[PDB]
Structure formats: structure tokens, C-alpha cells
Amino acid sequence: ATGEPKTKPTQSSVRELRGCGLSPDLIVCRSEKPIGLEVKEKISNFCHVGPDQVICIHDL
Amino acid sequence: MKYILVTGGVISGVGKGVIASSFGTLLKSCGLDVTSIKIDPYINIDAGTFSPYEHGEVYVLDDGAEVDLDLGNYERFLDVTLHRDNNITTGKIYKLVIEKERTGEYLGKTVQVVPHITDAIQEWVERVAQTPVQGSSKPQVCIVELGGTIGDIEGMPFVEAFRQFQFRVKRENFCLAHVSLVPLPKATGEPKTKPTQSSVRELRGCGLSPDLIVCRSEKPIGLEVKEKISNFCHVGPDQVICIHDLNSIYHVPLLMEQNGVIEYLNERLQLNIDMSKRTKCLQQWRDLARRTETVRREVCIAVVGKYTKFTDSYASVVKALQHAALAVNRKLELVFIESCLLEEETLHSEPSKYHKEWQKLCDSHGILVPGGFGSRGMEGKIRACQWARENQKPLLGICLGLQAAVIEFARNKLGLKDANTTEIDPNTANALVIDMPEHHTGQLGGTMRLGKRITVFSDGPSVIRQLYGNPKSVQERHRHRYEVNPKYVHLLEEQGMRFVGTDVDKTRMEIIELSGHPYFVATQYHPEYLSRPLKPSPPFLGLILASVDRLNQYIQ
Amino acid sequence: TGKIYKLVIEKERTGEYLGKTVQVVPHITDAIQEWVERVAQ
Ligand SMILES: Nc1nc2c(ncn2[C@H]2C[C@H](O)[C@@H](COP(=O)(O)OP(=O)(O)OP(=O)(O)O)O2)c(=O)[nH]1
Ligand SMILES: Nc1ncnc2c1ncn2[C@H]1C[C@H](O)[C@@H](COP(=O)(O)OP(=O)(O)O)O1
Ligand SMILES: [Mg+2]
Ligand SMILES: [Mg+2]
Ligand SMILES: [Mg+2]
Ligand SMILES: [Mg+2]
């Protein structure tokens, strides 16, 4: 329906973890299908991690 | 006045717009007058400076305002003419408050968020709720949709404003439907209620409480998940509504009616709706859904566009094509074609994709070249127009498609191989499409030819004139900044083309048509913005009829 | 606050953020940090 990977739940989870006092050093993104470069860039920009700190594991 | 607030769960593509439009449809079927206010917590004044990828296709109103596609959905489902005040952004509220503070309305106290920004938001909502929108109709229910999800930094002022607003107008006049997502991952295999519980916890911490929980999934969720949501959201079993992905959005009002939403809202908001009279209320939507289910004949239209990576970037165009396909009892097979892959540069890089897209274009009954901005993909549109004109394939170009058609005609028939648009090639020997002088003041955003205009039919038999109903002039909405150049106009007209659409001044050409070719129509305005489920846009209807070789029969 | 929001709205109305959604975290905070950088120096 939406037809695109959504990064908002991960942003909210990172915000909650930081408000709890912990800043992620890696972020593992679980998806059914591989996400594009722009999705990882959005994750890095809005969850405030480097582009290489966003690990993307899909349904192997 | 009664209010329904539709908030978002974990994502912003969950379906709040469709849920709000279905609320409006259900209430207007009963007999009420429904207003719709879209709240966009972004700081942009309007949606005219948005890419189609950001949130979908940009909608243009009668007064020129460029807004979200949610307002397009509201107009399509409710058949109402919205205004600029029906969209509330953060930028609008802050600009209003800053202007008031500068003038001196707030003299004496500092201007804050909670006492001033939220007060301005509540004043805006109350004032625009009462503004007539369908004529002399005085609204009874206002459906406010909050863009985004609960928990965003931009949405905190609006959530606090509505937390105060529910007590300002009493709870009997205020309801809240929360729309959430229930993901079902393949690895886990089970619907997950945790994000909905998190959303409800956040919305309760913010001071509100969902009267309804609308759970969105791809497939119907089992009763265990629904009961878990009812248990962990402190709402009753019958206050959780499960809406899955349906074949069309005409099924959403029917599904919500089957779920007892109308009765719950009548009891919760004291709407005093009578059930005995409200029988066969949604007959139009039931008929439309049945027709969408039972269409067998196939019509294939190739959309040669540049924003095909996101399918909602052409939402209004797809809806107009669907309306035209249903108006002639045809099933619409829509094949999006990236115009970049049709260019010769793609041939030397991805020959497989080049030939695949070209055989996609050659196997369709009709071609549609939509509008757009920038120079990327323009050559693909010109190549598609050339193929359509050479092979007698019907083509309907919109805005940027008219410029591409004019450029192709000048380059091929007139021999001007350097013909181009100033938007793309400012240093052009033969500038076939030039910029309009009064829309290039260096201030992007609300500075084009926006909204309803007047287009005059030329003196001469044209089938596009007959499609509209043999009028003398028509009023259509524009969103363009560049125009066709007069002398080239003249030359081309002489050659093989007929500029059959102009304005009152008879200088700005809007509609072109070709002698010979069965259907080659290009317009400067957007016909999709005025398309309604029972009122298909005449250009799209003509394109469909020419594609299925039924235009001549429809003429007589 | 008023200065920052007025500055961002005026920038957006000209086309400095052409094509993107102007938000708080990427844009208001960037304006605040750019203000601090240009004033401190
Ligand atoms: N390029 C352009 N965009 C405008 C203009 N006026 C309003 N807008 C809007 C439409 C565009 O979607 C948005 C610009 O963002 P983008 O550059 O990402 O869209 P565009 O269609 O140009 O795609 P592209 O740049 O070729 O990748 O601003 C204009 O005069 N030129
Ligand atoms: N119940 C449903 N079944 C199938 N598709 C749906 C649906 N509800 C919405 N959609 C489609 C239509 C929209 O283009 C897209 C979501 O956009 P939307 O309805 O405007 O939601 P939002 O306002 O949250 O962005 O998904
Ligand atoms: Mg949306
Ligand atoms: Mg919406
Ligand atoms: Mg987004
Ligand atoms: Mg651009």
C-alpha cells in the first residue's frame, strides 16, 4: 500500500533508547527485502549514526 | 460543532487520509455536512516546493494553493471545493503568531508555545470548521487529520493544542480515532501488537486517549491479536476496527460500516442519526466497488513518467485513468514506464532494460505523458511522443507533455534540430518553449500560474472541443511556469498542428491537436485535478476511447 | 525562537530547501547551529 520502506519506527526506537540514556553504536535493520541506499542514508541522518553504523540484515 | 481527530501510529503512510475520507463519506451519507482540515506539522507554507517523492503528488486548488494529496482525496470522496485555510502547517501558525506579535496584539506578555501557538491552532481549527465549503452549507462535523505519527517533535504543539481543545469543547463534541500498523513479518509469522501498544502509551502520556483503534494490516488479523489489542489498549473489544489492504479504496467505507463505526460515532458524539432512514446510503460506493470487481475487458496505458519509483507520485493521474476506464467498462492495466530508460543513453548502458521498456511502450493501447519539473527524463518523453505520432498510437500529454510534443514536432517536421525549452536550454537558437515573464521573480513557491483559469476554444472543428461538450470556453487548473513561443506557434500551426486552446488574450496557447493522427492531444493544464469518480476528465476519457478504438462511435 | 522560525520560513519561501520537507530537527536545529557558528566567530 505504502510501497516503500519506512524508517519512522526505527527513529522512534532510537529516540526512546537515547531518552533512556543509551546511544546505539550499531543499528541492525530487519527487513523482508533489501532496502536501498536512500533508506540507509535516512536512517543515518535521523537516528544520528554514521552510514557504516547501519547494518541491514534481510530475510536470508 | 463535532470533531473527529485522526492520529497516526508507527508510520505516516498507514492510511489516515483514507480513514478520514471514509469517515466523511459515511457521515455525509447519513445527511450531515462534513468539513476536512489537514494538519501538516512541517514548516513549509504550502506543498508547492515538494518533490513528488516526499509525500506523493502535489494537489492544486481552485484558489491556487498547492496542497497535499489528502485534500485531493477529500475532494474526490466528498465532492467539495476546499480552500487554502483547510491546510494547517507549522509555518502558517508561526508566521501568523510572529506577525501578530510584531504588530502588537500580544503586548504585555512573552509569546510562548502552550498559551499562544496552541491558542492560535485552536482558533484556526474553530474558524475554518465553520467556513462553508460546498456553497451555503453550514458544516456540522469537522474531521481534522494530524499528519505524521504521535511522538514527533513537530507534532507536539498540535497534540498539546488538541489536549486542551477536547476540554475546551467538552468530550461529547470531540472524538479520536487512532490508526496504527500491525506488521506480520515472514520470519516471525505472527501479527505483532507491540507497536500499537507503544503508540497508545505515547498518546496517553501526551494527555489524550483513542476512542477508536483502527488496526491496519495486509491480511485480516486473528481474534487473538484483536483481543490482545483490546486488553493492552484499555479499549473495548468493539472499539478496535481491523482494516486490511483492500482491492480498491471504495471498500474502506463499506468495511467500516460493516464494523459498526457509524453506530459507535452516533452514540459517542450524539450525532442523533436515525438508522431507519439511513438504508442503502452507500449505494454509489457499493456500485463502484462491484464494477471495479467485475471489469473483464482490458485497456493498457503506458505512463511515460519520471517519478515512477514511487507509485503515489501520480496519484491523481492514476485516479483519473481509473475513472475513465470504469466509465467505459474497461479494466485498467497501468504500466509505468521510466522515461529515462527510453533514452538512447540507456541503450549503451542497460540494453536489456532499454528494449524491455520499449516493448512495454509498443505493446500498450495508449500512451500518457504527464507533467513534471526539471530536465531529467525529458528526452524520454520526447522520444515517446515521436513514436506515438509516427505509429498512430494515441497520446495524451499534460503540461510538460505539451512542451515535449511541441519540441518534437518542431525538431522533426520543421527541421529545427536545436529546438528546446528555456527551462532546460536557456541558450537556445529556437526557443520553442519560453518562460512566462511574470513568474520568474526569483521567489519559488506560490509564484506560478496556479489554479483555475479560462481557456478559449479556437474557431474551428476540433474533437477535443467536442469531448468537453462543444463549449466556447472551459475553466481548468494550471501549475506551470513556462509557455509556448508565439512565432514558432504560428509556423507549427501552419505545418500540421492546430493550437485549438488559448486564453482570452489569444497569446498563451494551452491545447494542441494534430491533423491526421487519430488522437494526439496535449494540454497546458492538469485535467486530473478535476476528475471525480462519476465525472471522468474529458481528455482521459478521449484517450481511453481512442486506445480501445471506440472514439468514433462515441462521437456519434 | 521567533528569529529562527522567521528566518527558516523566509528561506523556505525563496527556494533554499527546494524539493524537501522542512522539519524541526534537520532544519530548525541546523539554523540554530548556523546562527551560533556565525555569531560566535
Ligand atoms: N525543478 C523545479 N521544481 C519546482 C519548481 N517550482 C516548484 N517546484 C517543485 C517541483 C519539484 O518536485 C520540486 C523540486 O524538487 P526536485 O528537484 O527533487 O523535483 P524534480 O521534478 O525537479 O526532479 P529532479 O530534480 O530532476 O530529480 O519543487 C521549478 O520551477 N523547478
Ligand atoms: N485500507 C487500505 N487498503 C489498501 N490501501 C490503502 C488503505 N488505506 C490507504 N491505502 C493506500 C492509499 C494511499 O495512497 C496510501 C496511504 O496514504 P493515505 O491513505 O493518505 O495515509 P496517510 O494519510 O497516513 O498518508 O495507501
Ligand atoms: Mg501521506
Ligand atoms: Mg494523509
Ligand atoms: Mg517520508
Ligand atoms: Mg530539481
From Swiss-Prot, chain B:
Molecular-function annotations in GO: ATP binding; CTP synthase activity; identical protein binding
Entry keyword set: ATP-binding, Cytoplasm, Glutamine amidotransferase, Ligase, Nucleotide-binding, Phosphoprotein, Pyrimidine biosynthesis
Pfam assignment, any one: CTP_synth_N
Entry EC number(s): 6.3.4.2
Pathway involvement of the protein, from the record: Pyrimidine metabolism; CTP biosynthesis via de novo pathway; CTP from UDP: step 2/2
Tissue specificity remark: In ovary, expressed in oocytes, follicle cells and nurse cells. Also expressed in larval and adult testis (at protein level). In larvae, expressed in lymph gland, salivary gland, regions of the midgut, testis, optical lobe and trachea. Isoform 1 is expressed in adult testis, ovary, accessory gland and head. Isoform 2 is weakly expressed in ovary.
Residue ranges constituting the Glutamine amidotransferase type-1 domain according to the UniProt record: 300-554
GO CC, one annotated term: cytosol
Family of the protein in this entry: Belongs to the CTP synthase family.
Function: Catalyzes the ATP-dependent amination of UTP to CTP with either L-glutamine or ammonia as the source of nitrogen. Constitutes the rate-limiting enzyme in the synthesis of cytosine nucleotides.
Protein name: CTP synthase
Biological source species: Drosophila melanogaster
